[PDB]
Design a protein around this ligand. Structure first.
Ligand SMILES: CSc1ccccc1CC(=O)N1C[C@H](C)C[C@H](C(N)=O)C1
Ligand SMILES: [Zn+2]
Length: 139
C-alpha cells in the first residue's frame, strides 16, 4: 500500500484504489496503473521535475529503504493478474532490488522529490510508475 499526497490530490496504484478514490476520481490510466483522486486536505509531498536515474525507495516487505539505479520511463510488458490482462504498462521504470505485490504504493524519491510509486516487480527487479510528467499535480 502507499499514496502520494500533493495539493488537493491523492495518487495511488489504480489496482489498489478504494470506492472513495473512484467517487472523487480526477484521472486514471490502466496502462500506467495510476489513479488520482481529490482530497479535502492539502498535501505536502514535492513532485520531482527531473530526469534522475538514481534514488531511494521504500520496501514495506523489508521495512527498509533501498538506494536504486532505475531505467528511463518506458513501455514494458507485464504478465496477467487479478487486476489486469497481459499487457504493456507505459511510463514504467525498472530497477534491481527487492519487491513483493504488497510493496505497491511504496514511494521512490530522488534529491528533487517524489519520482513515482512501486507498481510491478520481478526476479530481483522492481518497477515504479513514473509521476514526474504529470505537471498538473503542482497546479
Ligand atoms: C511490486 S509488484 C510484484 C513484485 C514481485 C513479484 C510480483 C509482483 C506482482 C506484479 O508485478 N504484478 C501484480 C501487481 C499487483 C500489478 C502489477 C501491474 N502493475 O500490472 C503486476
Ligand atoms: Zn531528480
Amino acid at each position: 500500500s502507499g499514496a502520494i499526497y500533493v495539493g488537493n490530490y491523492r495518487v495511488v496504484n489504480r489496482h489498489l484504489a478504494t470506492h472513495n478514490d473512484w467517487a472523487n476520481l480526477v484521472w486514471e490510466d490502466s496502462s500506467r496503473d495510476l489513479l488520482v483522486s481529490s482530497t479535502t486536505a492539502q498535501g505536502c509531498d514535492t513532485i520531482a521535475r527531473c530526469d534522475c536515474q538514481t534514488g531511494v525507495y521504500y520496501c514495506s516487505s523489508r521495512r527498509k529503504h533501498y538506494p536504486v539505479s532505475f531505467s528511463k520511463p518506458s513501455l514494458i510488458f507485464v504478465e496477467a493478474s487479478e487486476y489486469y490482462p497481459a499487457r504493456y504498462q507505459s511510463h514504467l521504470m525498472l530497477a534491481v532490488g527487492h519487491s513483493e505485490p504488497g510493496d505497491c504504493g511504496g514511494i521512490l524519491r530522488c534529491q528533487h522529490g517524489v519520482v513515482g510509486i512501486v507498481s510491478t516487480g520481478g526476479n530481483g527487479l522492481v518497477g515504479f510508475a513514473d509521476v514526474r510528467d504529470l505537471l498538473w499535480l503542482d497546479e
